[PDB]
Amino acid sequence: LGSSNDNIELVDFQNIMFYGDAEVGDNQQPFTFILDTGSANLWVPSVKCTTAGCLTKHLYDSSKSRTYEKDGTKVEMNYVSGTVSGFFSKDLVTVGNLSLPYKFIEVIDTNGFEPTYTASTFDGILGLGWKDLSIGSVDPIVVELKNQNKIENALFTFYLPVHDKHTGFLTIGGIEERFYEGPLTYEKLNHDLYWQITLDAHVGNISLEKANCIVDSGTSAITVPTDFLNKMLQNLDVIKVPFLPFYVTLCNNSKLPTFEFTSENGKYTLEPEYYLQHIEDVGPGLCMLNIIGLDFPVPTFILGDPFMRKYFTVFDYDNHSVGIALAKKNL
Numbered sequence: 001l002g003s004s005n006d007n008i009e010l011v012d013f014q015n016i017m018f019y020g021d022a023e024v025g026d027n028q029q030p031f032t033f034i035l036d037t038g039s040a041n042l043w044v045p046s047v048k049c050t051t052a053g054c055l056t057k058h059l060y061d062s063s064k065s066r067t068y069e070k071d072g073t074k075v076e077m078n079y080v081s082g083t084v085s086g087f088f089s090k091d092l093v094t095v096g097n098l099s100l101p102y103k104f105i106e107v108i109d110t111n112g113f114e115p116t117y118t119a120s121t122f123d124g125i126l127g128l129g130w131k132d133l134s135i136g137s138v139d140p141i142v143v144e145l146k147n148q149n150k151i152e153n154a155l156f157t158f159y160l161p162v163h164d165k166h167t168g169f170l171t172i173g174g175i176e177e178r179f180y181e182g183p184l185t186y187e188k189l190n191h192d193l194y195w196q197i198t199l200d201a202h203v204g205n206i207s208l209e210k211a212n213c214i215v216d217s218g219t220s221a222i223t224v225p226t227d228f229l230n231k232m233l234q235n236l237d238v239i240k241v242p243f244l245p246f247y248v249t250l251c252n253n254s255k256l257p258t259f260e261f262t263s264e265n266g267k268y269t270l271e272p273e274y275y276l277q278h279i280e281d282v283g284p285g286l287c288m289l290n291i292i293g294l295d296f297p298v299p300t301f302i303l304g305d306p307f308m309r310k311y312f313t314v315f316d317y318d319n320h321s322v323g324i325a326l327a328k329k330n331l
């Protein structure tokens, strides 16, 4: 296929978060979403949502769409970040220049997601993980488009925006060379759930062999197991503000190590310039480390936004793998 591909522009927010737009209904009602490789359902607040978080948002009115098909099955959507609840509905979903009938969650109660939702500019969340990661056993949007021949390949890629520099693009259907430099290395999904792969993690002299690494566009920090983080902070001139998950350091702290994740195919690193937020802050150069300690049953690193900002990433449902390449600095 001489190119093709459905490109959706990603809108940056202070190098912290980014968003993308999609539409629901044959009348293509507009909504801003967190495009999330770490969940597998699409949800939008309904016209029937009276909570406070819903007051500033674009709302879905299924009565204005001929393609709406009632479902009604009640759903409670529990993220680590909070809870939204509502019911299943079916209607047309438009992503970029493609449309398909689709089952999403019409949310009527966001109390379990406030004050977060109230202080959010996104309307909803659009999951991009595997079918089994979803509530309802909903086949991924991209898998669908492929089934219906609307796209070349059942894969999507993320070219994240870089603040002040350039825009991003979630590209569905194929891989565009305009976004990366050097080689594109594939790492096999270890499971068809999250986009999780096995990499040895190394920082300084601490090494965690065969760490489970979740590639999540929906996580704004790099997460690290706590015992690993504990060993690496020893003597680093990095201060933890107690109670709150924040780690601060002088932006010029020479001791700051580079994260190194490796497979027999490639070696991915994240230098201090990539995980340090602030830069020229409160006082001299106090910088915040965009890293937080988080423990899962098996040692896991969530390779969130800070990793994806440096690395162009490819998500291939056909080959059950994640491809990784150095993102091009500018378009």
Ligand SMILES: Cc1cccc(C)c1OCC(=O)N[C@@H](Cc1ccccc1)[C@@H](O)C[C@H](CC(C)C)NC(=O)c1cccc(N)c1
Binding pocket: 034, 036, 037, 038, 039, 040, 077, 078, 079, 080, 081, 082, 125, 133, 134, 135, 214, 216, 217, 218, 219, 220, 221, 223, 292, 302
């Ligand atoms: C924003 C942020 C900062 C730092 C660390 C994290 C983890 C983070 O992100 C917080 C967060 O909630 N992110 C999620 C998406 C999200 C982002 C913003 C607001 C709400 C949800 C997903 O990216 C990841 C999340 C956790 C996994 C990786 C353990 N998945 C589920 O909870 C989930 C998955 C499948 C099914 C269901 N029902 C739920």
